[PDB]
Design an enzyme around this catalytic site. Structure first.
Site, PDB file in Angstrom:
ATOM      1  N   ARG A   3      27.520  40.495 -59.599  1.00 27.07           N
ATOM      2  CA  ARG A   3      27.477  40.805 -61.029  1.00 27.07           C
ATOM      3  C   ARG A   3      26.890  39.578 -61.713  1.00 27.07           C
ATOM      4  NH1 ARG A   3      27.254  45.224 -60.397  1.00 27.07           N
ATOM      5  NH2 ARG A   3      28.514  47.021 -61.078  1.00 27.07           N
ATOM      6  N   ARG A  73      32.940  41.608 -67.851  1.00 29.96           N
ATOM      7  CA  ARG A  73      31.619  42.041 -67.416  1.00 29.96           C
ATOM      8  C   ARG A  73      30.600  41.499 -68.421  1.00 29.96           C
ATOM      9  NH1 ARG A  73      34.114  42.330 -63.488  1.00 29.96           N
ATOM     10  NH2 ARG A  73      34.187  44.013 -61.933  1.00 29.96           N
ATOM     11  N   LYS A 109      39.160  45.676 -65.667  1.00 32.19           N
ATOM     12  CA  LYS A 109      38.014  44.958 -66.217  1.00 32.19           C
ATOM     13  C   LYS A 109      37.844  45.253 -67.705  1.00 32.19           C
ATOM     14  CE  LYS A 109      35.144  48.258 -63.912  1.00 32.19           C
ATOM     15  NZ  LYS A 109      34.011  48.577 -62.994  1.00 32.19           N
ATOM     16  N   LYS A 111      35.234  44.915 -71.173  1.00 31.73           N
ATOM     17  CA  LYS A 111      33.818  45.015 -71.511  1.00 31.73           C
ATOM     18  C   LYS A 111      33.639  44.802 -73.009  1.00 31.73           C
ATOM     19  CE  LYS A 111      32.366  47.860 -67.633  1.00 31.73           C
ATOM     20  NZ  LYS A 111      31.856  49.119 -67.032  1.00 31.73           N
ATOM     21  N   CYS A 328      23.007  56.659 -63.279  1.00 33.15           N
ATOM     22  CA  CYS A 328      23.527  55.510 -62.534  1.00 33.15           C
ATOM     23  C   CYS A 328      22.838  55.379 -61.172  1.00 33.15           C
ATOM     24  CB  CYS A 328      25.033  55.644 -62.331  1.00 33.15           C
ATOM     25  SG  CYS A 328      25.431  56.924 -61.085  1.00 33.15           S
ATOM     26  N   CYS A 334      25.604  53.168 -53.524  1.00 32.34           N
ATOM     27  CA  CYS A 334      26.968  53.187 -54.071  1.00 32.34           C
ATOM     28  C   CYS A 334      27.959  53.777 -53.069  1.00 32.34           C
ATOM     29  CB  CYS A 334      27.045  53.985 -55.366  1.00 32.34           C
ATOM     30  SG  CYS A 334      28.664  53.784 -56.059  1.00 32.34           S
ATOM     31  N   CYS A 373      29.510  60.031 -60.130  1.00 28.74           N
ATOM     32  CA  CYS A 373      30.923  60.291 -59.921  1.00 28.74           C
ATOM     33  C   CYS A 373      31.623  59.978 -61.231  1.00 28.74           C
ATOM     34  CB  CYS A 373      31.473  59.441 -58.747  1.00 28.74           C
ATOM     35  SG  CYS A 373      32.016  57.749 -59.173  1.00 28.74           S
ATOM     36  N   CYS A 377      29.537  55.334 -64.773  1.00 29.59           N
ATOM     37  CA  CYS A 377      28.611  54.230 -65.013  1.00 29.59           C
ATOM     38  C   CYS A 377      27.345  54.673 -65.720  1.00 29.59           C
ATOM     39  CB  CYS A 377      28.197  53.544 -63.725  1.00 29.59           C
ATOM     40  SG  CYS A 377      29.602  53.181 -62.628  1.00 29.59           S
TER      41      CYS A 377
HETATM   42  C1  SRM Z   1      24.610  49.344 -62.016  1.00 32.29           C
HETATM   43  C2  SRM Z   1      25.596  50.159 -62.870  1.00 32.29           C
HETATM   44  C3  SRM Z   1      24.989  51.538 -63.176  1.00 32.29           C
HETATM   45  C4  SRM Z   1      23.537  51.552 -63.569  1.00 32.29           C
HETATM   46  O1  SRM Z   1      22.783  52.390 -63.056  1.00 32.29           O
HETATM   47  O2  SRM Z   1      23.061  50.767 -64.404  1.00 32.29           O
HETATM   48  C5  SRM Z   1      26.957  50.310 -62.210  1.00 32.29           C
HETATM   49  C6  SRM Z   1      27.155  50.420 -60.829  1.00 32.29           C
HETATM   50  C7  SRM Z   1      28.388  50.456 -60.200  1.00 32.29           C
HETATM   51  N1  SRM Z   1      29.593  50.426 -60.843  1.00 32.29           N
HETATM   52 FE1  SRM Z   1      29.928  50.523 -62.827  1.00 32.29          FE
HETATM   53  N2  SRM Z   1      27.966  50.335 -63.138  1.00 32.29           N
HETATM   54  C8  SRM Z   1      27.373  50.059 -64.326  1.00 32.29           C
HETATM   55  C9  SRM Z   1      27.908  50.330 -65.577  1.00 32.29           C
HETATM   56  C10 SRM Z   1      29.181  50.898 -65.727  1.00 32.29           C
HETATM   57  C11 SRM Z   1      29.661  51.454 -67.006  1.00 32.29           C
HETATM   58  C12 SRM Z   1      28.839  51.645 -68.237  1.00 32.29           C
HETATM   59  C13 SRM Z   1      28.889  50.398 -69.088  1.00 32.29           C
HETATM   60  O3  SRM Z   1      29.670  49.442 -68.844  1.00 32.29           O
HETATM   61  O4  SRM Z   1      28.145  50.344 -70.094  1.00 32.29           O
HETATM   62  C14 SRM Z   1      30.945  52.061 -66.751  1.00 32.29           C
HETATM   63  C15 SRM Z   1      31.691  53.016 -67.643  1.00 32.29           C
HETATM   64  C16 SRM Z   1      32.285  52.301 -68.868  1.00 32.29           C
HETATM   65  C17 SRM Z   1      33.689  51.909 -68.494  1.00 32.29           C
HETATM   66  O5  SRM Z   1      33.887  50.925 -67.745  1.00 32.29           O
HETATM   67  O6  SRM Z   1      34.666  52.603 -68.869  1.00 32.29           O
HETATM   68  C18 SRM Z   1      31.198  51.681 -65.324  1.00 32.29           C
HETATM   69  C19 SRM Z   1      32.396  51.975 -64.676  1.00 32.29           C
HETATM   70  C20 SRM Z   1      32.684  51.642 -63.351  1.00 32.29           C
HETATM   71  C21 SRM Z   1      33.997  51.960 -62.725  1.00 32.29           C
HETATM   72  C22 SRM Z   1      35.211  52.672 -63.287  1.00 32.29           C
HETATM   73  C23 SRM Z   1      35.995  51.647 -64.100  1.00 32.29           C
HETATM   74  C24 SRM Z   1      37.324  52.166 -64.590  1.00 32.29           C
HETATM   75  O7  SRM Z   1      37.799  51.733 -65.656  1.00 32.29           O
HETATM   76  O8  SRM Z   1      37.981  53.015 -63.953  1.00 32.29           O
HETATM   77  C25 SRM Z   1      33.820  51.520 -61.350  1.00 32.29           C
HETATM   78  C26 SRM Z   1      34.811  51.688 -60.227  1.00 32.29           C
HETATM   79  C27 SRM Z   1      35.873  50.608 -60.301  1.00 32.29           C
HETATM   80  O9  SRM Z   1      35.829  49.629 -61.082  1.00 32.29           O
HETATM   81  O10 SRM Z   1      36.856  50.677 -59.539  1.00 32.29           O
HETATM   82  C28 SRM Z   1      32.459  50.954 -61.279  1.00 32.29           C
HETATM   83  C29 SRM Z   1      31.911  50.537 -60.088  1.00 32.29           C
HETATM   84  C30 SRM Z   1      30.547  50.371 -59.867  1.00 32.29           C
HETATM   85  C31 SRM Z   1      29.979  49.984 -58.514  1.00 32.29           C
HETATM   86  C32 SRM Z   1      30.128  48.481 -58.295  1.00 32.29           C
HETATM   87  C33 SRM Z   1      30.637  50.762 -57.341  1.00 32.29           C
HETATM   88  C34 SRM Z   1      31.739  50.023 -56.595  1.00 32.29           C
HETATM   89  O11 SRM Z   1      32.842  49.741 -57.116  1.00 32.29           O
HETATM   90  O12 SRM Z   1      31.588  49.710 -55.387  1.00 32.29           O
HETATM   91  C35 SRM Z   1      28.552  50.415 -58.709  1.00 32.29           C
HETATM   92  C36 SRM Z   1      27.548  49.896 -57.717  1.00 32.29           C
HETATM   93  C37 SRM Z   1      26.392  50.882 -57.538  1.00 32.29           C
HETATM   94  C38 SRM Z   1      25.302  50.240 -56.720  1.00 32.29           C
HETATM   95  O13 SRM Z   1      25.091  50.555 -55.522  1.00 32.29           O
HETATM   96  O14 SRM Z   1      24.579  49.374 -57.245  1.00 32.29           O
HETATM   97  N3  SRM Z   1      31.834  50.996 -62.486  1.00 32.29           N
HETATM   98  N4  SRM Z   1      30.125  51.030 -64.753  1.00 32.29           N
HETATM   99  C39 SRM Z   1      26.034  49.436 -64.111  1.00 32.29           C
HETATM  100  C40 SRM Z   1      26.079  47.931 -63.929  1.00 32.29           C
HETATM  101  C41 SRM Z   1      26.480  47.293 -65.263  1.00 32.29           C
HETATM  102  C42 SRM Z   1      26.676  45.810 -65.048  1.00 32.29           C
HETATM  103  O15 SRM Z   1      25.673  45.070 -64.995  1.00 32.29           O
HETATM  104  O16 SRM Z   1      27.821  45.302 -64.944  1.00 32.29           O
HETATM  105  S1  SF4 Z   2      29.167  56.453 -61.487  1.00 28.92           S
HETATM  106 FE1  SF4 Z   2      30.044  56.587 -59.470  1.00 28.92          FE
HETATM  107  S2  SF4 Z   2      28.220  56.963 -58.234  1.00 28.92           S
HETATM  108 FE2  SF4 Z   2      27.434  56.190 -60.131  1.00 28.92          FE
HETATM  109  S3  SF4 Z   2      27.195  54.028 -59.739  1.00 28.92           S
HETATM  110 FE3  SF4 Z   2      29.188  54.341 -60.734  1.00 28.92          FE
HETATM  111  S4  SF4 Z   2      30.567  54.446 -59.079  1.00 28.92           S
HETATM  112 FE4  SF4 Z   2      28.546  54.752 -58.157  1.00 28.92          FE
END
Ligand code: SRM
Ligand code: SF4
Ligand SMILES: [K+]
EC number: 1.8.1.2
Length: 464
Positions: A3, A73, A109, A111, A328, A334, A373, A377
């Protein structure tokens, strides 16, 4: 989990050249992936190159968040404000907040964003803590604070929900860091740590009440919030193409599909951006829509930059629909993915483009997002039309968000395939084209026409 910390998405051309070289030489996929939190990711790094990637970042002044124990983040900041003079100060505050929050272990986490109305490009309602800039005479005077957004949900679990952020009130600029610390520490102390699925601030606020949380933040910060100062959003998209900035400087925003920077046949996107980095006089800005701004181009340099961008495929024209769609990462990298998102979106929007043309609305757009999923994200749970992955080739279809991202879309159909989604949207887009009021968005239309009920109070009415 890598990150990379990059507050407000600002990255220098020297930094760009270093990450370009690493991506090409030291990763399986060879790409730079822009993320929708205004930073970048490498995919497929390898064991022999994990120590090299932290040394690479350090060599150009960059660092990665220690995700093992750091729950913060990347801090977002509006990338291309209409009042261009406001960006420097807002970005300075995004950096100050980002450095202030560097390692108090949090329950989940956390944000944060800095937002410049009328643009909600950073999607403030997906974030725990949001500072909405208020300015007088081109100078920041303070922020409206909104707290408690978050999109993650669990399929079939009605104790989880997406939630928008709640207004607390206005703070003068001088109290920003004290307020930020007070929100973070109140969430640290009151969050439900034992149940990780209930630990996010959005759940804390609903458990104790917004007024209770707000009063504790006031106590700890030593301030009293003022009434909210007026603000309104007009959209969330990037400003694709050239716009005039401050002085004689110009900003070129490049649409990059899925933020995926790689050389493709006849479209050397990655080499083109390197060529631009070598001659560009300013910085780049990664946007929250996974696009890239070549920022601060002098007028005399526009032609040279544009030549490289057009020849490399970075300025290939796409529809307004494609510019306002997002997915995403999902497969292949992922580990949590249920359905494709990034790899699905280009052909999905090809099909949507055909439906928009069929119904005579090819110049319009619908904020349309696919998330692989229910972690969310891709920010489908703030879209006008959102798809949420359920299983290979299957999605929950959500309708009824709005263009500015202040309403959660309710689920319309569950666990359906792409042909079923397209047949449904064909019907609905046709209805919207014929029955919309002047300037009416698709999401607002589906609510007004009774196609879907709005989500008015998500902790209590998101789930049917
Ligand atoms: C790259 C990105 C999506 C994208 O296409 O741009 C992303 C990718 C992933 N996110 Fe995220 N999230 C990304 C924005 C988000 C957002 C949107 C936002 O922040 O604007 C959310 C929803 C907003 C929120 O948090 O409520 C988001 C909520 C999650 C969650 C669920 C968090 C929760 O509260 O339950 C996970 C899973 C977890 O944390 O356990 C997660 C987990 C992940 C992981 C690391 C999967 C994992 O845990 O192993 C992903 C890796 C995918 C890969 O192969 O690269 N990511 N993720 C974004 C990277 C942002 C960054 O630089 O940090
Ligand atoms: S929404 Fe689900 S499938 Fe898409 S990047 Fe986040 S964790 Fe992976
Ligand atoms: K994009």
């Amino acid at each position: 989990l890598l990150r990379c910390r990059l507050p407000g998405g600002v990255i220098t051309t020297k930094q760009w050249q270093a990450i370009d070289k690493f991506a090409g030489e030291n990763t399986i996929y060879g790409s730079i992936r822009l993320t929708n939190r205004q930073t970048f990711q490498f995919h497929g790094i390898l064991k022999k190159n994990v120590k090299p990637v932290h040394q690479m970042l350090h060599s150009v002044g960059l660092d990665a968040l220690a995700t093992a124990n750091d729950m913060n983040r990347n801090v977002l900041c509006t990338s291309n404000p209409y009042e261009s003079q406001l960006h420097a100060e807002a970005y300075e505050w995004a950096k100050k907040i980002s450095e202030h929050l560097l390692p108090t272990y949090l329950p989940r986490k956390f944000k944060t964003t800095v937002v410049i109305p009328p643009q909600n490009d950073i999607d403030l309602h997906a974030n725990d803590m949001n500072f909405v800039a208020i300015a007088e005479n081109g100078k920041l005077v303070g922020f409206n604070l909104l707290v408690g957004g978050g999109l993650s949900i669990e399929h079939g679990n009605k104790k989880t929900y997406a939630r928008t952020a709640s207004e607390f009130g206005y703070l003068p600029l001088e109290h920003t860091l004290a307020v930020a610390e007070a929100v973070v520490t109140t969430q640290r102390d009151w969050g439900n740590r034992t149940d990780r699925k209930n630990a996010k601030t959005k759940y804390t606020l609903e458990r104790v009440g917004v007024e209770t949380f707000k009063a504790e933040v006031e106590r700890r910060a030593g301030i009293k919030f003022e009434p909210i100062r007026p603000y309104e959003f007009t959209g969330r998209g990037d400003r694709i193409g050239w716009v005039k900035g401050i002085d004689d400087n110009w900003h070129l925003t490049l649409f990059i599909e899925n933020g995926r920077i790689l050389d493709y046949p006849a479209r050397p996107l990655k080499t083109g951006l390197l060529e631009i980095a070598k001659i560009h006089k300013g910085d780049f800005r990664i946007t929250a829509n996974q696009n890239l701004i070549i920022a601060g181009v002098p007028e005399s340099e526009k032609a040279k930059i544009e030549k490289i961008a057009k020849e490399s495929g970075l300025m290939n024209a796409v529809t307004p629909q494609r510019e306002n769609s997002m997915a995403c990462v999902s497969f292949p990298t992922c580990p949590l993915a249920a359905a494709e998102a990034e790899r699905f979106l280009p052909s999905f929007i090809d099909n949507i483009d055909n439906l928009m043309a069929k119904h005579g609305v090819s110049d319009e757009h619908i904020v349309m997002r696919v998330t692989g999923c229910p972690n969310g994200c891709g920010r489908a749970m703030l879209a006008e039309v959102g798809l949420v992955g359920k299983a290979p080739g299957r999605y929950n279809l959500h309708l009824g968000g709005n263009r500015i991202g202040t309403r959660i879309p309710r689920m319309y159909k569950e666990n359906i395939t792409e042909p079923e989604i397209l047949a449904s949207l064909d019907e609905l887009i046709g209805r919207w084209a014929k029955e919309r009021e002047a300037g009416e968005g698709f999401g607002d239309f589906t609510v007004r026409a009774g196609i879907i009920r709005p989500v008015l109070d998500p902790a209590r009415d998101l789930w049917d």
